[PDB]
């Protein structure tokens, strides 16, 4: 598709995706089952003032990815910005 048209259609889609964002339940379980296995993401960085979505990713991994992660042998680092800032910045102590 033409960029000048694709731009318009993406704009219109996004607009609706944000307008109706609070008009429909947050499909977060399905989002977690999209970025964990469908992307095979080894590093989940939570940006926020308290670890909430880092607790939720860790509960999801413990509950239904302790057999998929062993079957692929991939390690997953669930890191919140509030708590686990050091290794995200790569700033350890001696």
């Amino acid at each position: 598709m033409k960029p000048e048209v694709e731009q318009e259609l993406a704009h219109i889609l996004l607009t609706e995706l944000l307008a109706y964002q609070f008009a429909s339940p947050v499909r977060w379980i399905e989002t977690q089952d999209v970025f964990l296995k469908d992307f095979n993401t080894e590093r989940v960085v939570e940006i926020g003032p308290s670890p909430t979505l880092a607790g939720m990713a860790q509960r999801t991994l413990k509950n239904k990815y302790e057999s998929y992660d062993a079957a692929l042998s991939l390690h997953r680092e669930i890191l919140c910005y509030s708590k686990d800032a050091k290794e995200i910045y790569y700033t350890p102590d001696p």
Partner: protein, 768 residues
């Protein structure tokens, strides 16, 4: 003339031999079931070797090939290109980049390009040094490809400076250069006269402009041609006034990754055999003495490969694709059976790729091998928190130190002052109980027009009323006060902007530190959703972002009717389906809330799908939320399943058996007064501080005015489809963002919007 090397195919046996030879035991290089076995990065030079080395042969590159030093060897994985596999046919090209008569010797820079399936895959740079006294300057040359320099023309002085340059020549001389992004993709050839001056300098290349569609279009050319010069003014000018598309940002301190003791092999004949480098000096002692060397020196390319196998281990975490570039400058010659000790150090970042600066010494603590390598981080996704704990002074620790953070907060706090006549920074810092906004003066009227531009739609007796947010704020208004019980950071309309700024500021700091990959996939929980898009896509400015999320907060605040105390008869509940019973499924919860909602007639809906059979948040009439908490306190105590009994016992009866338990729930729930207190059940925690059932079907009405607000703020000229496509994961669909007829259809199914229904129908009109 471009040198072409023969088509080299990569076979499994060749890789096993090479990997054993160098000591690279990366799992990626072992043949497993249902796993294509990757070719090593190092293996690259093998393929190239026949072509690359052939570059130093030609008659006019005269020199003593016994006394030939290999100065440095670098690989550079071309962006997007997958690392080499087995069965890949790898065509090789080579060119002489530079040949220069340095006082002590001649330096020959060879650039190999590897091509798999027509496209280029990687670039292999090789610097060779002929030790000797050359003066063949007429034969010397340097056809460099310059790094693309990008210049932002913000002012009209830059324009006059550019137009003063004779080399700068647009195709259309009247082209408007204000507020543009020009990329100069120059190719600078230099023929030398002497060791320290040039004879012919010829920089040239197209000058593109970034369109609103993020596609570069040629608007002119560099046409620089000089004679006797002491430099290139085009690259000088671009360096002084432009960027390099990506910036090397050091860390505060280097990080000592590890100290690893490599061992050179007794013989070089295994590595020489696999690498097709049969340089006598490496294998035969008599050549080694005649070349004045201290013995059969271990291969330099072996020394590299026997280190690049440890950076791939320790920095890249035994993952091959993560290594993109690898350079190594062979300082000192090394002998067989040396105890090489590598000192690995992470140094900094460039565009979310780690930089690892290492040096290798022998047993004498003499610098033998040095180089660096740029390692992609683990494939990283971002998740942005929704509303939560808004403790007073969140992000201020960052805001005082970080510059980026200062620049975000400031820009937001300026816009808020100018537009809505308050300071968010103040509100976060000291959490004022009440805040007055005075509309006095021309500035004060504009702020009052900004506050009288806010409207929402609600259902009134089956009629859509477009009521006015801040109804009291009219033409005759001088002041308006926000009033909280304890603090205004607790009120949604300051909560949401405050949190969104903290996130944006944190992320913007990460960008300043250069820790953000260009492919990272981003998803935001509820409010956070907006912070992501601002942070990863730049779709909104800081000014547009805060203005949106403020309007969101206020739209959610007045979405529902409140009494004089400011309490609605709605709430939220945090259900744990594991606390009620292990047998209790997510579909059992969906069944229960469906049946309560349908019979009772009261709004109740699951609004957050948080954790599978452990956390869900259900919103609706706080009476209906009292029925379901009293049903899930009943079901646990009676230990009765609905999903077992709906199949195993009787069809449709389990509906009619739940029905009569809803009667005992709804008869006690309806008794309590309309500002009731919901009680903490077994598997239901009442969300304190929240009264509005958002993410439900209650807010269908509120979309229309809100959807108009984004169209005013969110401009299509800032929507960069590449930056969004396949990365953004909306909470509406829970599917990677793609501009397809499938996606549109799926969005129209979930959200009955006519402006996408027409696009679905006219899909083929937009295809062409």
């Amino acid at each position: 003339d471009v040198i072409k090397g023969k088509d080299f195919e990569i076979t499994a046996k060749e890789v096993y031999d090479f990997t054993h030879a160098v000591g690279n035991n990366c799992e990626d290089f072992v043949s497993r079931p249902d796993r294509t076995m990757l070719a090593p990065m190092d293996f690259a030079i093998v393929v190239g070797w026949r072509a690359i080395i052939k570059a130093i042969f030609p008659n006019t590159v005269d020199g003593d090939l016994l006394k030939l030093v290999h100065l440095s060897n670098g690989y550079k994985m071309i962006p997007g290109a997958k690392p080499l596999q087995v069965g890949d046919v790898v065509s090789t090209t080579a060119v002489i980049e530079s040949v220069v008569n340095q006082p002590t010797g001649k330096i020959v820079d060879v650039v190999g390009t590897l091509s798999r399936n027509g496209k280029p895959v990687m670039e292999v740079t090789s610097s060779f040094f002929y030790r000797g006294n050359y003066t063949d300057f007429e034969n010397t040359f340097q056809k460099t490809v310059e790094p693309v320099y990008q210049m932002h023309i913000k002012t009209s002085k830059d324009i006059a400076v550019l137009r003063s340059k004779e080399w700068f020549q647009l195709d259309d001389e009247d082209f408007d250069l204000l507020n543009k992004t020009l990329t100069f993709e120059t190719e600078t050839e230099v023929t030398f006269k002497n060791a320290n001056i040039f004879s012919s300098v010829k920089c040239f290349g197209p000058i593109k402009v970034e369109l609103p569609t993020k596609e570069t279009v040629e608007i002119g050319i560099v046409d620089y041609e000089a004679g006797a010069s002491h430099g290139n003014p085009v690259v000088d000018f671009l360096k002084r006034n432009g960027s390099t598309l990506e910036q090397k940002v050091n860390l505060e301190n280097p990080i000592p990754i590890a100290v690893l003791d490599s061992y050179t092999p007794s013989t070089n004949e295994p590595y020489a055999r696999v690498s097709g480098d049969l340089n006598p000096i490496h294998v035969s002692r008599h050549f080694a003495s005649y070349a004045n060397l201290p013995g059969t020196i271990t291969h330099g390319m072996f020394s590299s490969a026997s280190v690049r196998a440890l950076i791939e281990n320790w920095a890249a975490d035994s993952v091959s694709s993560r290594v993109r570039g690898y350079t190594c400058q062979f300082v000192d010659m090394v002998l067989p059976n040396t105890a090489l000790k590598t000192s690995i150090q992470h140094v900094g970042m460039i565009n979310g790729r780690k930089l690892i600066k290492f040096e290798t010494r022998n047993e004498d603590d003499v610098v033998v091998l040095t180089g660096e390598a740029e390692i992609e981080q683990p494939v990283t996704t971002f998740v942005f928190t929704g509303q939560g704990s808004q403790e007073q002074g969140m992000g201020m620790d960052l805001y005082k130190t970080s510059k980026a953070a200062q620049d975000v907060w400031n820009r937001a706090d300026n816009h808020f002052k100018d537009t809505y006549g308050f300071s968010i920074l103040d509100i976060v810092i000291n959490n004022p109980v009440n805040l007055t906004i005075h509309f006095g003066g021309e500035k004060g009227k504009r702020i009052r027009e900004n506050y009288s531009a806010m409207i929402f739609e609600t259902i009134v007796d089956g009629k859509l009323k477009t009521e006015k947010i801040f109804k009291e704020i009219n033409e005759h208004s001088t002041s308006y006060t926000f009033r909280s019980e304890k603090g205004l950071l607790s009120a949604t309309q300051f909560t949401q902007p405050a949190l969104t700024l903290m996130e944006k500021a944190a992320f913007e700091d990460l960008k300043s530190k250069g820790l953000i990959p260009a492919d990272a996939t981003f998803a935001g929980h509820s409010l956070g959703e907006y912070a992501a898009l601002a942070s990863l896509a730049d779709v909104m400015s800081i000014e547009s972002l805060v203005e949106v999320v403020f309007y969101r907060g206020m739209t959610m605040q007045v979405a529902v009717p409140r009494d004089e105390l400011g309490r609605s008869n709605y709430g939220m509940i945090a259900i744990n389906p594991g606390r009620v019973a292990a047998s209790f499924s997510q579909e059992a919860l969906q069944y229960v809330v469906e049946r309560v909602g349908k019979r009772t007639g009261w709004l109740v809906e699951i609004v957050n799908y948080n954790v599978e059979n452990q956390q869900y948040v259900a919103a609706g009439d706080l009476r209906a939320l009292d029925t379901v908490t009293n049903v899930l306190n009943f079901i646990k105590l009676q230990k009765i399943d609905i999903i077992e009994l709906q199949k195993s016992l009787s069809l449709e009866e389990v509906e009619g058996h739940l029905f009569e338990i809803i009667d005992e729930a709804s008869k006690k729930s309806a008794v309590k007064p309309r500002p009731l207190k919901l009680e903490r059940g077994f598997a239901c925690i009442p969300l304190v501080g929240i009264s509005v059932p958002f993410h439900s079907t209650y807010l269908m009405n509120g979309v229309k005015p809100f959807k108009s607000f984004l169209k005013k703020n969110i401009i299509k000229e800032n929507v960069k489809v590449a930056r969004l496509a396949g990365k953004y994961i909306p909470n509406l669909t829970a599917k990677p963002f793609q501009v397809t007829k499938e996606y549109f259809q799926d969005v129209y199914d979930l959200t009955g919007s006519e402006p996408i229904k027409e696009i679905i129908d006219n899909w083929e009109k937009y295809e062409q």
